[PDB]
Write a protein that binds this ligand. Sequence first.
Ligand SMILES: *CCC(=O)N1CCN(c2nc(NCCC(=O)N(C)C)nc3cc(-c4ccccc4F)c(Cl)cc23)CC1
Ligand SMILES: Nc1nc2c(ncn2[C@@H]2O[C@H](COP(=O)(O)OP(=O)(O)O)[C@@H](O)[C@H]2O)c(=O)[nH]1
Ligand SMILES: [Mg+2]
Length: 169
Amino acid sequence: GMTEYKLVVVGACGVGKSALTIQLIQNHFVDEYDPTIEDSYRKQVVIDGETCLLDILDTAGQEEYSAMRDQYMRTGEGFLCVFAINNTKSFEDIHHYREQIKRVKDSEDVPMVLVGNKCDLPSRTVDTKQAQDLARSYGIPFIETSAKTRQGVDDAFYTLVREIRKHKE
Ligand SMILES: *CCC(=O)N1CCN(c2nc(NCCC(=O)N(C)C)nc3cc(-c4ccccc4F)c(Cl)cc23)CC1
Ligand SMILES: Nc1nc2c(ncn2[C@@H]2O[C@H](COP(=O)(O)OP(=O)(O)O)[C@@H](O)[C@H]2O)c(=O)[nH]1
Ligand SMILES: [Mg+2]
């Protein structure tokens, strides 16, 4: 049957995990999505000529037990690690998310993509070079996005699918 890619979107509160996912799935920018809602979304896309299904968990890191979070963490194939380019703390927190991903997968070789979001905003506090150097240290792609304008949104998710394809082969 049709190939499915199970993706998990993670990162600190307010970096735009929900806005990015909703821009990807529904092709519009949600100004204030409830910060405590976790939910999953499915969309049929074509990536490099291949029709496939994206199965995406937009995490909200609530301490209540979430069976959806449980199933996606263990069976998820790739992770988008999101920070906002005007949120220095959320860039600094990438190390924690990368560590947690390695731990939940019990694997040093997990498909991931570093995403720097909100690039429509002026006077960023996290330089492109900063994040390019970090992703290079991790050996992962870095993509700059704007969930508001849609810049780089498809690129971020499709690049993560390509990282997963490389891992599987
Ligand atoms: C603000 C609402 C929101 O979008 N989220 C809630 C908080 N959340 C989250 N927070 C943490 N905190 C750890 C603090 C830290 O950096 N220390 C060094 C102590 N940790 C999370 C971990 C995960 C996670 C668990 C397992 C595997 C992969 C993971 F990313 C998640 Cl999903 C969320 C948080 C972010 C979301
Ligand atoms: N200007 C701008 N605002 C954004 C962008 N992405 C998200 N936001 C806003 O940032 C705030 C937090 O976004 P949200 O998607 O709820 O973040 P989450 O906590 O990671 O799920 C919301 O007010 C969004 O409208 C963006 O790319 N550009
Ligand atoms: Mg959210």
